[PDB]
């Protein structure tokens, strides 16, 4: 890794934020130089605002072009909502079923692995003999694979004993009844 | 609740830039600037929508022109390098002779230039590998994913080699079947 020549970076983000689907929409145009946001257009505000000194000129210059400000204010409909509609089918309503597996580790530890699922809202529970274990449970938290699936690991610290049935239970919008995987001493 | 983000950048003096849509942290697509074609993150996205690729190039031209202005306006203040955190992990839990995928997840860095090499037993591997573009983060740093499909063997050992201006030396991230 050579070439210490100084770098200069410009980033544009148009963030459409949705609440209860189309019900409430907010549009955020952020302009960022060298990782610092310098000026933005917040649909809640309705005009450009400077975030740092560096952004002041653009705010004024763009604000003074009133035909553009209107284009922008409409964008929550012409862009944000329009786009929401086009993508919903394969994004908002994407459902992939988790795959669940159990296996022991040492540190004894039990490991529940839930992989390959979408969306990321999920509930994973441990059961000892059908008594939910709410303590001694340590989770890896959501992990985004980058391929539109998630994975996570939930660990139960426990000293097993034959005659004990451990269950990992998973709830997720992709399935109707919880998935369960059982592991025995 | 959800968020869609059209994210684009121009970088100087490298003269690199990208255009992409992000849904809740996932790439919907980006535009291949050279081929001027829309590249859907998952093939099946491409049958339920389309996008005017040329538009991206126009946007990138505006981005570049504005960069050039900001560069001078800042009086040539350069970006500060932020080295990434790197993490290797598998698509699913590993069972020998069951095909899996190794994931190199490069995160929390800027500017968006990295070098990533897959190292099997210390040797470079390129067979079947793939990667993502630079994905956006709220603090304006970047994410990037590299992928290496593989057969889990007990003799085989793996490394993800990552270089970036914010690092004093390549960052190696190890993974073996244990």
């Amino acid at each position: 890794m050579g070439d210490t020549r100084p770098r200069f970076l410009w980033q544009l983000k148009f963030e459409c934020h949705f609440f209860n689907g189309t019900e409430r929409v907010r549009l955020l145009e952020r302009c960022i130089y060298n990782q610092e946001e310098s000026v933005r257009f917040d649909s809640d505000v309705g005009e450009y605002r400077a975030v740092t000194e560096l952004g002041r000129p653009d705010a004024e210059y763009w604000n003074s072009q009133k035909d553009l400000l209107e284009q922008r204010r409409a964008a929550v409909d012409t862009y944000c909502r329009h786009n929401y509609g086009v993508g919903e089918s394969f994004t908002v309503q994407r459902r992939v079923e988790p795959k669940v597996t159990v296996y022991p580790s040492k540190t004894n530890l039990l490991v529940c692995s839930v992989s390959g699922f979408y969306p990321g809202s999920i509930e994973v529970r441990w059961f000892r003999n059908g008594q939910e274990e709410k303590a001694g449970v340590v989770s890896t938290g959501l992990i985004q694979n980058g391929d539109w699936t998630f994975q996570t690991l939930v660990m139960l610290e426990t000293v097993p004993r034959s005659g004990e049935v451990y269950t990992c239970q998973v709830e997720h919008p992709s399935v109707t009844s919880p998935l369960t995987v059982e592991w025995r001493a | 609740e959800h968020v869609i983000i059209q994210a684009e950048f121009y970088l100087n003096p490298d003269q690199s830039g990208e255009f992409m849509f992000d849904f809740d942290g996932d790439e919907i697509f980006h535009v291949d600037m050279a081929k001027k074609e829309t590249v859907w993150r998952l093939e099946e996205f491409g049958r339920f929508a389309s996008f005017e690729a040329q538009g991206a190039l126009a946007n990138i031209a505006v981005d570049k022109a504005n960069l050039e202005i900001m560069t001078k306006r800042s009086n040539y203040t350069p970006i500060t390098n932020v080295p990434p955190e790197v993490t290797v992990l598998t698509n699913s839990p590993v069972e020998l002779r069951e095909p899996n995928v190794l994931i190199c997840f490069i995160d929390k860095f800027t500017p968006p230039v990295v070098n990533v090499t897959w190292l099997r037993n210390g040797k470079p591997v390129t067979t079947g590998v793939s990667e993502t573009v630079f994905l956006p983060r709220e603090d304006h740093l970047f994410r990037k994913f590299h992928y290496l499909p593989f057969l889990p063997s007990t003799e085989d050992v793996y490394d993800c080699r990552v270089e970036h201006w914010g690092l004093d030396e390549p960052l190696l991230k190890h993974w073996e079947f244990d």
Partner: peptide, 15 residues
């Protein structure tokens, strides 16, 4: 068709 939003140009002859 998915819609693109277009960034504004900055003032080229600055004050």
């Amino acid at each position: 068709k998915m819609r693109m939003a277009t960034p504004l140009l900055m003032q080229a002859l600055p004050m």
